[PDB]
Amino acid sequence: DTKEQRILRYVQQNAKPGDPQSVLEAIDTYCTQKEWAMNVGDAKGQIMDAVIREYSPSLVLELGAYCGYSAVRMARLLQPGARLLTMEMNPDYAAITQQMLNFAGLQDKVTILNGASQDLIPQLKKKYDVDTLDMVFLDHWKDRYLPDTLLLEKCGLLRKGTVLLADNVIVPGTPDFLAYVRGSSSFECTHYSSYLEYMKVVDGLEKAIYQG
Numbered sequence: 001d002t003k004e005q006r007i008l009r010y011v012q013q014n015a016k017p018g019d020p021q022s023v024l025e026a027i028d029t030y031c032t033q034k035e036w037a038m039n040v041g042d043a044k045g046q047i048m049d050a051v052i053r054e055y056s057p058s059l060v061l062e063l064g065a066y067c068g069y070s071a072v073r074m075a076r077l078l079q080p081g082a083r084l085l086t087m088e089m090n091p092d093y094a095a096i097t098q099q100m101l102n103f104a105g106l107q108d109k110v111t112i113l114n115g116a117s118q119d120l121i122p123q124l125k126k127k128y129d130v131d132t133l134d135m136v137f138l139d140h141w142k143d144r145y146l147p148d149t150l151l152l153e154k155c156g157l158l159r160k161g162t163v164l165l166a167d168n169v170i171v172p173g174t175p176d177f178l179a180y181v182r183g184s185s186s187f188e189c190t191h192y193s194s195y196l197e198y199m200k201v202v203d204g205l206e207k208a209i210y211q212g
Contacts, residue, residue, distance in 0.1 A: 004096045007031065007067040011103055018105035020076035027069045027100070043194035043203040044167055045073050048137075051207060052077045055163050057134030061124075062086035063117055063148050064139035066093050068100030070167070074137065075106040084110040085128065087120050093140075117148050121155055132159035138166040145169075145177040153210075160212030170204040181208035 010030045015022040028041035052060075052074055058081065060074055065088040075084045088094040094114035101107050111128070113120050124130045136152065138145045145166050152158050169178060170193075181187040187208040193201045 002092065004067045004093060008096055008099055011100060015103060017103055020072050020104040020106060023072055023100060023104040024069065027067060038198065038202045039196055040203045041069060043196060044205065047192045047194065047205050048073050049077060051163065051165050055135060058082045059133055060084045060135045060137060061133050062137045062139060064088060064141045064144065065097040066140045068097035070137060070139050071097050071110060072100055072104045072106060075101060075109045078109050085113065086110060087113045087115065087117055089116050117144060118151065121151050124157060133157050133162055135163040138164060142168060142174045145174060146180055158210040160210065162210040164208040166206045168203060169206045170201050178206065181206065186211045
């Protein structure tokens with residue numbers, strides 16, 4: 001029906017329920033069969049994995065979601081007691097992301113919030129138990145990365161050592177987000193460009209560690 005829901009029935013037919021590696025492989029194979037320019041799955045996932053593993057976050061906020069690849073990717077790795085909160089505005093993306101997490105057997109570790117980042121971020125402290133975040137994954141919507149970052153700061157959600165990891169920041173792309181976290185003395189930045197075997201970047205990611 002819709003391509004995001006096609007990723008769904010495909011996972012439903014090929015993956016083993018309760019096996020997130022199988023679900024990720026299924027999502028990857030499907031999107032690579034067609035949509036991703038090259039193999040963005042492998043290109044982003046292994047960076048995502050190293051970052052989660054380096055910092056051991058207990059509370060991760062994902063900002064943006066499309067077909068749930070990134071949420072499955074993180075959630076599979078969360079230590080016992082750790083949680084993922086994911087916000088996504090498009091109700092169908094939120095629904096597919098939820099269904100994908102259920103399939104993979106990770107629904108107990110995640111909360112999907114279907115709403116605008118701008119309404120939901122201010123609600124995070126009172127309505128969910130949040131003090132500060134350990135990690136923020138910024139995902140599908142490049143023009144939201146800066147304003148969401150600014151609003152997390154405003155709202156006192158970042159502490160010294162909070163990791164922001166932003167997907168799909170390839171130059172000339174996201175000029176404003178990059179210019180902000182780079183020129184800011186409150187963020188230490190590391191840029192990852194995944195080529196796979198190619199000469200052109202398949203995915204680029206930005207890690208920005210908030211300094212307090």
